[PDB]
Design a protein around this nucleic acid. Structure first.
Lengths: 107, 97, 50
RNA sequence: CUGCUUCUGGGUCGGGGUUUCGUACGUAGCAGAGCAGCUGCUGCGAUCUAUUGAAAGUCAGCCCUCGACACAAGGGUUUGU
RNA sequence: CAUGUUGGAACAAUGUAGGUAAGGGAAGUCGGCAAGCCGGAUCCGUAACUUCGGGAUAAGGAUUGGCUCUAAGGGCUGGCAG
RNA sequence: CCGCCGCAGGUGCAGAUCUUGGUGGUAGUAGCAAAUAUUCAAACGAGAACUUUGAAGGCCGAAGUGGAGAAGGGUUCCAUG
């Protein structure tokens, strides 16, 4: 119920539309963080180093239009922020987004 | 917490730039209490501080292009920016002759 | 500069030794008026002449 | 200016519709100026032809979904004749 | 090296700094100011005037990519081969 | 410290674009816009847009934002707190 992991394709292209060249990739990280808070209501969204890398792969201006993302709500580690759970947003390499549904991947 | 003393020393001992000093981010606190070059030379032997390899500047497409230049490709009339004299001077042609 | 005369390096020596704060037992003396050293001199602010 | 359970609702993604651009990569070809080798085969070769009105983008302030996916009967501050 | 002594969020007007504009083309303006045109190299071609030095990149044209070839221009060693 | 009788004067401030010191309104305002750009994770820590480490994306581009010096500075060097 709480340790839930779900696949998602995030249309970055329609969350980045009209932002300036030197703020596209920085903004793309902030809508993937909003996307985590929205689907899995956790303020503590920790976004994987490889997903950062994946967004920045084409540089600051050019960003992947769609990125596949594993979104995993988990039990928080010790020295607790009052946020009971956090979301770990992990990159999933994909060759085609054509006919990719949101899948409830299981433990 | 602060490894500036130990990245500076590591750069001096490796005889490289501090650009190329890799400090193991996992064993940070064991690098932290180095404080001397002799202590850092141990962490080079232990392979905790490592010289990063040189960022590659391959001149392979340079060679591929220079091989085309040898056959007269890319050397046409609309690729000549300096004068015929500037490119290959008449005084050097004469000297040769 | 790096190249100095002996005369200037003795001048610069005295000015260094004058640039220390008062000892914390000087204000415990009977007729103390000194709170802190007023004649302190930072190397950006006041440029020591020359 | 709007929306926030008539078992319904917006939202995310997907899929169609529209549309922009002009025919993707890969593979195939006794298409290709010619050239090199080996006794016709084999290479190197811009480009060309088919696959291919292909590929790619398309609401972020396009249209349509009843296909997936979670979410939604809350929280806060006030108001009395 | 961390964007020059701060970030965050929006993308109104006025700026400042960049662009682009149908048809016309200086009608604008004190004035083509500003902007734009022009630009490299090769091959042509080049006037008035002149102190014969120039003017001169005068003006005015053509060509320029990629690719596959062809020809020409050399050393070394015992009209030649290697 | 003062009343009375005398004595004496550097003896009465609203101004002098007065002097010195203090404080307003302006006003939480102008502003914190020259030289392209940051991002993710971790660590220390009461506390992190800015510190440090790692990873990414960038910039200077050898007439350098590089490595050394002369003038000038004078301890700014270095470690620890």
């Amino acid at each position: 119920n709480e340790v839930v992991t779900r696949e998602y394709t995030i249309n970055i292209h329609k969350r980045i539309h009209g932002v300036g060249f030197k703020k596209r990739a920085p903004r793309a990280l902030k809508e993937i963080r909003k996307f985590a808070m929205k689907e899995m209501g956790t303020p503590d969204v920790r976004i994987d180093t490889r997903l950062n890398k994946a967004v920045w792969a084409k540089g600051i201006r050019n960003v992947p239009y769609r990125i596949r993302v594993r979104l995993s709500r988990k039990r928080n580690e010790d020295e607790d922020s009052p946020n009971k759970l956090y979301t770990l947003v992990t990159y999933v390499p994909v060759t085609t987004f054509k006919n990719l549904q949101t899948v409830n991947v299981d433990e | 917490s602060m490894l500036r003393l130990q990245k500076r020393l590591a750069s001096s001992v490796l005889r490289c730039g501090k650009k190329k000093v890799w400090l193991d981010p996992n064993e940070t606190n064991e690098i932290a209490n180095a404080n001397s070059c002799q202590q850092i030379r141990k962490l080079i032997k232990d392979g905790l501080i490592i010289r990063k390899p040189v960022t590659v500047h391959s001149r392979a497409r340079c060679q591929k292009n220079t091989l085309a230049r040898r056959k007269g490709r890319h050397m046409g009339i609309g690729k000549r920016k300096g004068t015929a004299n500037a490119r290959m001077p008449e005084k050097v042609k004469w000297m040769r002759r | 500069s790096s190249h100095k005369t002996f005369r200037i390096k003795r001048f610069l020596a005295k000015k260094q030794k004058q640039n220390r704060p008062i000892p914390q037992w000087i204000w415990m003396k009977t007729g103390n008026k000194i709170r802190y050293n007023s004649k302190r001199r930072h190397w950006r602010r006041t440029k020591l002449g020359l």
